């Protein structure tokens, strides 16, 4: 399988066997000798995917990584097919599609036993189950699914694909294992990921939208009912069935090649607003967008030189960028991103988590799927879900930046490049970031404290409010104004605004509001500065962990200690948590804090100044009656009018289909309190307690041969932070879900 390519594989490097499955710890030479202490077990899980600590061959590591990628893709295919099958044979997708505005999207039926059958609440049309917030029904309606058999077929295809990915992983780790030369083709890999994966993907999805999503949805919104819509392929068998909806189809693909594109203005629109029937983005707009994105990505996938002389050498581009401030510039970065997996992982985790948070922010205010803006639970759930995914990916980006610093950083190849100079003024960077975090904390949280003290003393006129000392976010208001004036001027062909959150019509579907102008005042200014503050503190922790992983004034030989170590003794005043791993540990807490305040802001602002009902007068009555302005300026406001008030749904959820949310609420509280034990103590006390219990077992000859050892310091920290995040996020999950499911 050469085909005059740059492919180079090894025909049989690893034999297939089952014997190593019976030796837990084969990948670690320190664990192969068998357990003697309980720590042996824990480390077996800690280094499972730590391929660098298993072998010093970059080629074998790349092969393990490739096959692990295939395995993870098989797992995600299995999960996606499970979701599709549960929508197929276990959901009310058809009863919902027949009448969305009067039925709740349900899935996952519970077996009636031990009382748990109560969780299958009535969702409409006689269906009993658990209301789902993932928004799968809206996505499937956007895709054009009409029959549950098609969800079943998608599940079958996904399971077939999962088997394919698993076979591919096995085949490329045991049969044809690609060489290290093949992975280092970053120019080719980039060309393909831009053109083949992204370009072709959006191109085919635009085609599917034009042939399946757009016609079916055009009819669906007009009330034609699902069972009366012809099948998606009857539109391909009958061109007149496509020309009746879009007369532009009657001219064929002749205007396309002749650049006569305007003819296609029937199905390739630039409406901008929302669909008045369902409250989602126009599928014509999404298809046009996918077409443009596909062309852009395909054109981008031609920049880099591969096997034909034409193209861009990324090494030459990086080395050609150097100025008076930065020395030799990006020289040596090609060698880093070609010989180091952790540098790539850090960059990609950072950008992917940012993209995920951007996805959350762009989907909450521009509802792309039909009838997703009406459902407040699904909106809030998707928002916070992508928020947390992005936060975790960013913390992991910091972790792997530090890992690269400790393991793959070579000072001999980083002589006066960007990384070298950053290491040479990290003190300035971190001191200024320290100051910026302090200035933000004083000038965001401190403003809330001022308001609390002034209101408590009976001095409302001395507060930072819209009615006293105003903090008007003038710039955001100006940009919103510019957005509301773009269609017709700075956006000539666009029919409406990009989003009504900046302003415009208060689009409402059914009895509820879909999207109205989101006003910004003093409380919004304060919350945005809280956001900046928390983001800065988290980034400070992570960046200091990365830059000081190799050395510091305290520990000039920190690199030799490794990336993951508890400390370097109680000397030098005390050196606990000096490692980069411990910086990731702290950045985890601060990411949790930042994202928690972000999602709380989202929930309260949407429920207060956006979400609500609309009576046949134009007048809007919001969920919690616009209390954001006068209450979100003090901490007591967030305690009373947000936490105390909106947790009434979660606490009184017993005896209904939401009692599980109260159960998980208490469970998250308990897991936070449980984490506190791992976070506040030390290993020595637990080892002494284990010594006493081991004596007690010696009294009756129940002493295990594997000596019980207390959790290591690093493991104690990992367990504590894992339980802390789990408990807090599950608490807010239950709270948000119950609240947004008990507001209509």
């Amino acid at each position: 399988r050469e085909a005059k390519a740059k492919v180079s594989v090894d025909n049989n490097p690893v034999p297939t066997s089952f014997e190593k499955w019976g030796k837990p710890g084969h990948f670690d030479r320190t664990l192969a000798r068998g357990p003697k202490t309980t720590t042996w077990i824990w480390n077996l899980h800690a280094n499972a995917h730590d391929f660098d600590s298993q072998t010093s061959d970059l080629e074998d590591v790349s092969r393990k990584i490739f096959s692990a990628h295939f395995g993870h893709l098989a797992v995600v295919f299995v999960w996606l097919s499970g979701m599709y099958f549960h929508g197929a044979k276990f959901s009310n997708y058809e009863g919902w599609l027949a009448d969305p505005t009067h039925i709740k999207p349900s899935a996952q039926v519970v077996w009636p036993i031990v009382g748990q059958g109560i969780l299958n609440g009535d969702v409409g049309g006689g269906f009993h189950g658990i209301q789902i917030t993932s928004g799968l029904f809206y996505l499937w309606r956007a895709s054009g699914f009409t029959d549950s058999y098609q969800l079943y077929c998608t599940a079958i295809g996904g399971l077939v694909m999962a088997a394919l990915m698993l076979f591919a992983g096995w085949f490329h780790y045991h049969v044809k294992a690609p060489k290290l030369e093949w992975f280092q083709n970053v120019e080719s890999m980039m060309n393909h990921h831009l053109a083949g994966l992204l370009g072709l993907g959006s191109l085919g999805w635009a085609g599917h939208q034009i042939h399946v999503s757009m016609p079916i949805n055009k009819l669906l919104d007009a009330g034609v009912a699902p069972k009366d819509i012809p099948l998606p392929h009857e539109f391909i068998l009958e061109p007149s069935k496509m020309a009746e909806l879009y007369p532009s189809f009657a001219q064929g693909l002749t205007p396309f090649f002749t650049l006569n594109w305007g003819v296609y203005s029937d199905f390739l629109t630039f409406k901008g607003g929302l669909n008045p029937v369902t409250g989602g983005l126009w599928l014509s707009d999404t298809a046009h967008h996918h077409l443009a994105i596909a062309v852009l990505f395909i054109i981008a996938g031609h920049m880099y030189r591969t096997n034909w002389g034409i193209g861009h050498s990324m090494k030459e581009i990086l080395e050609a960028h150097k100025g008076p401030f930065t020395g030799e510039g990006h020289k040596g970065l090609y060698e880093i991103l070609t010989t180091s997996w952790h540098a790539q992982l850090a960059i990609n985790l950072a950008l992917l988590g940012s993209l995920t948070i951007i996805v959350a922010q762009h989907m909450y205010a521009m509802p792309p799927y039909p009838y997703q803006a009406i459902d407040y639970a699904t909106q809030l759930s998707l928002f916070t879900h992508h928020m947390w995914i992005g936060g975790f990916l960013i913390v992991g980006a910091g972790a792997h930046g530090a890992i690269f610093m400790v393991r793959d950083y070579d000072p001999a190849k980083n002589v006066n490049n960007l990384l070298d100079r950053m290491l040479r003024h990290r003190d300035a960077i971190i001191s200024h970031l320290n100051w910026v975090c302090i200035f933000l904390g004083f000038h965001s949280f401190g403003l809330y404290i001022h308001n609390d003290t002034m209101r408590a003393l009976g001095r409302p006129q001395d507060m930072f409010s819209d009615t006293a000392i105003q903090l008007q976010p003038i710039f955001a208001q100006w940009v919103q104004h510019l957005h509301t004036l773009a269609p017709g001027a700075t956006a000539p062909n666009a029919l409406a605004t990009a989003s009504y959150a900046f302003g415009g019509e208060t689009i409402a579907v059914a009895g509820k509001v879909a999207m109205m102008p989101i006003t910004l005042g003093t409380a919004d200014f304060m919350v945005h500065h809280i956001h900046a503050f928390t983001i800065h503190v988290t980034a400070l922790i992570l960046l200091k962990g990365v830059l000081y992983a190799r050395s510091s004034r305290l520990v000039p030989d920190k690199a030799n200690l490794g990336f993951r170590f508890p400390c370097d003794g109680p000397g030098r005043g005390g050196t606990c948590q000096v490692s980069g791993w411990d910086h990731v540990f702290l950045g985890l807490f601060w990411m949790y804090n930042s994202l928690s305040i972000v999602i709380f802001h989202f929930s309260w602002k949407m429920q207060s100044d956006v979400w609500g009902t609309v009576s046949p007068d134009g007048s809007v009555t919001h969920v919690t009656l616009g209390n954001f302005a006068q209450s979100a300026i003090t901490i007591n406001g967030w305690l009373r009018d947000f936490l105390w008030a909106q947790a009434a749904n979660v606490i009184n959820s017993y005896g209904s289909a939401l009692s599980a949310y109260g159960i998980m609420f208490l469970a998250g509280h308990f897991v936070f309190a449980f984490s506190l034990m791992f976070l506040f103590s030390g290993r020595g006390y637990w080892q002494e307690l284990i010594e006493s219990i081991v004596w007690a077992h010696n009294k009756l000859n129940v002493a295990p041969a594997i000596q019980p050892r207390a959790l290591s310091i690093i493991q104690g920290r990992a367990v504590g932070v894992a339980h802390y995040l789990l408990g807090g996020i599950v608490t807010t999950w239950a709270f948000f879900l119950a609240r947004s499911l008990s507001i209509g």
Partner: protein, 79 residues
């Protein structure tokens, strides 16, 4: 309220706009392409500037000429 295009390419859109953009891109490639005849597939003799050094150079420069020509056509068509 759509941007007006042109249907048949006839004498204006083709030759006068598309082919001239292709020739401009061919000149820009012949001047600025670093590796011109480094492709694994070689071109047939030399002839003129319609195609001279390597099939990949001609293919890439025709693609860039098509980009330029589509842009200039949809521009002069008033958008």
């Amino acid at each position: 309220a759509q941007a007006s295009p042109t249907t048949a390419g006839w004498s204006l859109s083709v030759g006068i706009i598309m082919c001239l953009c292709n020739v401009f891109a061919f000149v820009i490639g012949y001047f600025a392409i670093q590796k011109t005849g480094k492709g694994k597939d070689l071109a047939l003799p030399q002839l003129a500037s319609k195609k001279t050094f390597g099939l990949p150079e001609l293919l890439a420069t025709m693609s860039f000429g098509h980009i330029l020509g589509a842009g200039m056509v949809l521009g002069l068509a008033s958008s």
